[PDB]
Design a protein around this nucleic acid. Sequence first.
RNA 1: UAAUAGCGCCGCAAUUCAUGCUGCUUGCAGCCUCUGAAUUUUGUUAAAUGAGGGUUAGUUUGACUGUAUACAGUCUUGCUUUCUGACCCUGGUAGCUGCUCACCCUGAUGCUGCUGUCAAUAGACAGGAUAGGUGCGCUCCCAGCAAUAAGGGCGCGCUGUAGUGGCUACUGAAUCACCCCCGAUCAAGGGGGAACCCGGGUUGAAAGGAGAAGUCA
DNA 2: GACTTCTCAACCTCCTA
DNA 3: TAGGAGGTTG
Length: 437
Amino acid sequence: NASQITIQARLISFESNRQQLWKLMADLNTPLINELLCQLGQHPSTVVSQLCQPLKTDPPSRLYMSAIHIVDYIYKSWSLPFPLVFETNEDMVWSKNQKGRLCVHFNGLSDLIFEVYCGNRQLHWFQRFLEDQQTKRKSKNQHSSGLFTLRNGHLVWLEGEGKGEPWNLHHLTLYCCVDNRLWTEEGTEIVRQEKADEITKFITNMKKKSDLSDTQQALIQRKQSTLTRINNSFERPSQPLYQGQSHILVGVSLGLEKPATVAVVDAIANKVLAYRSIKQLLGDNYELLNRQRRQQQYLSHERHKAQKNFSPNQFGASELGQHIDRLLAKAIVALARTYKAGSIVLPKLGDMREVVQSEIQAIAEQKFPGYIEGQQKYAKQYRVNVHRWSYGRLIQSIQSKAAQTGIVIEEGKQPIRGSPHDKAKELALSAYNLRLT
RNA sequence: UAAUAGCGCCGCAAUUCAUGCUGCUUGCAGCCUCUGAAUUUUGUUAAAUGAGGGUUAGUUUGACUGUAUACAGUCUUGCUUUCUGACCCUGGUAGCUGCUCACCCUGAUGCUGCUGUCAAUAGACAGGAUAGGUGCGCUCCCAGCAAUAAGGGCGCGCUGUAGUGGCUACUGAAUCACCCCCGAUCAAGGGGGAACCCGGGUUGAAAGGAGAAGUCA
DNA sequence: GACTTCTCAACCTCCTA
DNA sequence: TAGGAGGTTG
């Protein structure tokens, strides 16, 4: 699931409650470090479960389980404590304070009621969590847990500049992972379909082998309980999702001179419905692209100047590149949705060094026809000014936005040469040609 | 005193276009009114970019419902970012750390560069982001430096007190989004104005997917 | 900071209120 | 009886 998103909010409680939480978070981060050395040594994560059992009594029943999950994630990789991650829809017990504000009541923290401070841009998510738990409560456990839009969340701390306090210094911040497709009823239908198929496959696979007479029956019981409860739905808003025209393919072309260009082209026909260039996708946000290029030049010169012995290089850095890589994805997806596009085509990220090198060469021979010295000099001067874009965050942001809206993404092969509009059109057509296979 | 030239950018002009407009003939035909694209050629334009360091639980970007992408209704919380304004500053004082250096010569993706006044010492003091060059920046150029790229020479294995940096602690100013006043700042809002529009509104906007750990750049 | 992997329960099952 | 906290699992 690439459609799922993460929301955040700041929690606000008394000084005493924060004190208890800080003490427990320290008493939980201290032993999980000890669990690491024990865990890592034996391998050269199922055994980890009974590995923590002796560690239980050494120094929050649901919270000791939490540290187990974090380690498993680190292993498979190959004064703030670590976040307390809640890998359960039902770990948090939402409520509404007497003053109307929401509250969170964590499972292991019986007396720790935090007040939820968030933004109105995303208060509807917390209200949805509340309504979901309330709907389960009204139905008396007759709704499957797969559909409360709240997959998991982890509580983190944050740094402050007061420099005078153990926790008054630090700010709580809740990070709930919420499946965006789980908001509308029609999307929850597809989510229910996929989850039912997964449950069927998993139960068939597990029935095909033999397990313990009690754990196997209990897990299978939960499976059919989920299958029974999942058919009863919630009173969620209805939206017609997205239709998608198969023949219409929005082709997106990445380069150096133009950071990104698009081409809405028919595939059954051979006509381009409408091109858009980088100056036209970024409506009134083009000065942002220019100043980001200037900043990426300045920061690269500074990084080169710093050489080997340096102070931290984030001086003057920002997330302007990310803001532009999101403004661009929003515009590209909106353009796709306007023309009923069924898919957005993106270049393979692997072919993004060869493409930029070839584009630099093409510009060089375009300026200096055969004067090789001038071509090399201009290539150097161009690489000085027009730095390489960040073609990873852009492809990722488009993948997120399109998946959220409902537009599937395919990948083709960007042509080596030609005008950026022609490159985009031919990429889009090549994608359809390969889809025909 | 000098900044030629070069490259990126930004507009301003032309020209050809269509990603545009109109016409139906529905894919052709005109054109350039708009919206843009592509060349090349300009820098007057109060034309458009750009313009040191900071300052808001800042405004807008919102949800659902009914109707037809709009409007009406209801709810709304201050999270993380990005711009634009506006404002403030160009800092103390007290410790500590890092680097560099006998001298020349080359002069680096090196350093520094604003006004005014006083001295005309090398610095103060008042202003202050229009801050060396050009419409705007640069790893380019220019002026001074250059021991703090690199290399070359060359005194007695040293030349070492200065030049630059970093850090902590307590501090200074602005704690803002029409303006002021009193608050809050693990929360908390209230009060008083003014302009504009028609007792109500307005008095800038945007975007969010997080975390972990590696691989590096 | 910017690129690369990786994660995104759930009904059961007691046990106090 | 309805939450609260644990419990377990490919």
